Amino acid sequence: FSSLPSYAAFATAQEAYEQAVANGDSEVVLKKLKKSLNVAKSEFDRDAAMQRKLEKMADQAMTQMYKQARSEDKRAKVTSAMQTMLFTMLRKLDNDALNNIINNARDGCVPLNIIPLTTAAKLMVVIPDYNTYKNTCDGTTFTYASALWEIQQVVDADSKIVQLSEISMDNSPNLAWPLIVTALRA
């Protein structure tokens, strides 16, 4: 607006109007100068409101461009995170037993519920009280899913390690149940 020539035209028309007010020309000339000042002010109004609308729109387009760039960068970051998650879960497979059971299926499909039950190497048993502990995994080896498991650790609900010499009927009150016994496939 200010750098536009319309501002210069309005400013010089205002200067001419002040000079004619101080100069006392004829009333028809004064009406003429008021007319020229008014059309200069109308052109200034048009161009200045035009540039204000223009710069509002340009700032809007810049803001939406920022939003698009942020969305696309976050999409790239989420695709990277999903891909690395899938590839770590690939490296965590137990490929010998998994290949054995998949090649033992007549179609190549096995239900998902028996993928861990025949290929997992670690069994986590969660035990709520002592009678359950006595019945499911008494001693340092036990049986579940037709294999034999060897107890490698027992933690309590507080993630504290609990020795197997602790879990007795008289020390059952002082343990923070449930107990999470982690066993390995023998």
């Binding site: 609308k53 223009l54 920022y66 760039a69």
Partner: peptide, 15 residues
């Protein structure tokens, strides 16, 4: 009818 050229002011409209 509303403006404006990108390639102007010595720059190109971007971020």
């Amino acid at each position: 009818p509303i403006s404006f050229p990108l390639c102007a002011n010595g720059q190109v409209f971007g971020l």
